């Protein structure tokens, strides 16, 4: 019975691996697209909603300036993003439709999800009911079990990176810091409020930090605010290490117990790491109502169904200065991204 899931990952790891050892590469070109708007603009990031020319399909094209990625020492990570991204496949994993590059940029043509960054919707609602926090949570539990099975580590779990597709389910994005390792790593990456203590103290860490961020995420969904916060990141890091949590009057004694384990400084006791595995999470009382297979198939009534105004410029979001994307007449950083 549970051999289904035991026999599922196998099939998926084989599927994953084959793609990870023989990456897909340069599978479309800029000109085969028409830029529609700029959905964001980062220090090196950038997401320009586009429409595929030959088919009228819309994609969220992510554009990374080559020279910046390097300056920010994000080469390995940027390559980690593409490589892991073209191999994985999961219901809650935004699909990278196309990839390619030119003289000045690297392009990752992501699937466009017209639902709504869970952030805005969360800050708008204030906080999600436990039942609802559970709904999204569950999907994360599963998506990690998928990722982790492939020796993958997300490292950037937070509402922001969670999109709510039209059916009301989640699609994870932003794999900038995802990496495939079996030992333990050391880079300092993630978002202040979601960093496990072993990252802050830079001890060296594993997939355990992902189960920590879940706690933080679950807590921030149910509370309405992160379990650890302040003005400057230096402080955040402090509140975290001291490791003392306080729950809201309205938290079920069941949420707190679960959260008391996810947000656990002690690696030998925290859920997700221990021998029994993801079942100390999956089998917790707070997840009693949850039917794990119901969700994978997505046969569950979503709590919130975004009023999406169809494909493209539905409505709202926010406007940025439509910066042109230039392609130098010279190739920039050839050897570096050769495998991109």
């Amino acid at each position: 019975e549970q051999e289904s899931v035991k026999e599922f990952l196998a099939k998926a790891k084989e599927d994953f691996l084959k793609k990870w050892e023989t990456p897909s590469q340069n599978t479309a070109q800029l000109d085969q697209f028409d830029r529609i708007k700029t959905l964001g603009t980062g220090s090196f990031g950038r997401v320009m909603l586009v429409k595929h020319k030959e088919s009228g399909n819309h994609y969220a094209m992510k554009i990374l300036d080559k020279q910046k990625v390097v300056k920010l020492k994000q080469i390995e990570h940027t390559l980690n993003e593409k490589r892991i991204l073209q191999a994985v496949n999961f219901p809650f994993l935004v699909k990278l439709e196309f990839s390619f590059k030119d003289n000045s940029n690297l392009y990752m043509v992501m699937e466009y999800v017209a639902g709504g960054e869970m952030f805005s919707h969360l800050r708008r609602i204030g906080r999600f009911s436990e039942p609802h926090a559970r709904f999204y949570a569950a999907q994360i539990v599963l998506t990690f079990e998928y990722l982790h099975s492939l020796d993958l580590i997300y490292r950037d779990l937070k509402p922001e990176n969670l999109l709510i597709d039209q059916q009301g389910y989640i699609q994870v994005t932003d794999f900038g810091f995802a990496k495939r390792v079996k030992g333990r790593t050391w880079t300092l990456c993630g978002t202040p409020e979601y960093l496990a203590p072993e990252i802050i103290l830079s001890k060296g860490y594993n997939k355990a930090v992902d189960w920590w961020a879940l706690g933080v995420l679950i807590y921030e969904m149910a509370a309405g605010y992160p379990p650890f916060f302040a003005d400057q990141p230096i402080q955040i890091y402090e509140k975290i290490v001291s490791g003392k949590v306080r729950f809201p009057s309205h938290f079920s004694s069941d949420l707190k117990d679960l959260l008391r384990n996810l947000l656990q400084v002690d690696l030998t006791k925290r859920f997700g790491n221990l021998p029994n595995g993801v079942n100390d999470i999956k089998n917790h009382k707070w997840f009693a109502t949850t039917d794990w297979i119901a969700i994978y198939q997505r046969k569950v009534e979503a709590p919130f169904i975004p009023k999406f105004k169809g494909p493209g410029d539905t409505s709202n979001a926010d406007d940025y200065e439509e910066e042109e994307i230039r392609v130098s007449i010279n190739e920039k950083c050839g050897k570096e991204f050769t495998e991109f």
Partner: peptide
């Protein structure tokens, strides 16, 4: 109230990953 203190702060908008 913890909620207001949160709201009063500046880390209530879209947060940026660290890696400068």
């Amino acid at each position: 109230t913890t909620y207001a203190d949160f709201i009063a702060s500046g880390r209530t908008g879209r947060r940026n990953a660290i890696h400068d």
